[PDB]
């Protein structure tokens, strides 16, 4: 139904551009946004993500398999400036979790960010949150470069070798709680950001 394993549920995800007009006025543009699931054979995407060491094939083999999703974004790129990322997770357990985000060009890791997040109790469950985390410089320049390509065919061709892997882990037990693979296209002119969510299998 949703991006949820037995132990973690992603409630919200977004990457955005924020501009301050005056001290009382803000404008925000969402590049991508998440607030029955077809499946995708994980062997079809192995080469788009790093392997060898902490690889995507090794991660899935160790499982659990109900924690591996693929998100396909049609990103809206139609736009001093703050570039950020926000996410929110729910769990029925109070744990200390770790989020590893790896940006890859051509299946080769290029940026890595690790973050630790703690729970807040709310109405019987536990919330984890990344708020207005600064988008790193590689991504900001990549977006600027994308917007400078001559046509959407060149942007989407470039984006075919751009992926992000997110692994969320229980810091104590090292259990994989959520693993999300992200593939991207540019949304078509006045379509706005859209996505499909898949379960990864086999």
């Amino acid at each position: 139904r949703s991006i949820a394993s037995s132990k973690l549920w992603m409630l919200e995800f977004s990457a955005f551009l924020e501009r301050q007009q005056d001290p009382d006025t803000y404008n925000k543009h969402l590049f991508v946004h998440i607030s029955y699931l077809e499946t995708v054979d994980i062997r079809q995407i192995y080469d788009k993500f790093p392997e060898k060491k902490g690889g995507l094939k090794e991660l899935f083999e160790r499982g659990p398999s109900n924690a591996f999703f693929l998100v396909k974004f049609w990103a809206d790129l139609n736009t001093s400036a703050f570039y950020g990322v926000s996410s929110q997770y729910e769990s029925p357990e109070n744990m200390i979790i770790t989020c590893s985000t790896k940006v890859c060009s051509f299946g080769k890791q290029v940026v890595e960010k690790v973050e630790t997040e703690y729970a807040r109790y709310e109405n019987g469950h536990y919330l984890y949150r990344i708020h207005r985390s600064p988008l790193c410089e590689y991504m900001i320049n990549f977006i600027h470069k994308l917007k400078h390509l001559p046509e959407k065919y060149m942007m989407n061709s470039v984006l075919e070798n751009f992926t992000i892997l997110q692994v969320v882990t229980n810091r104590d037990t090292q259990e994989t709680l959520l693993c999300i693979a992200y593939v991207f296209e540019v949304s078509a002119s006045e379509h706005g950001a859209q996505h499909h969510i898949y379960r990864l299998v086999k």
Binding site: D41, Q44, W74, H191, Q194, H196
Partner: peptide
């Protein structure tokens, strides 16, 4: 490089909502 559209993916993969 094997193009993504020649790989076996659900048809939805290229159908933007």
């Amino acid at each position: 490089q094997v193009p993504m559209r020649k790989r076996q993916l659900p048809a939805s993969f290229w159908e933007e909502p």
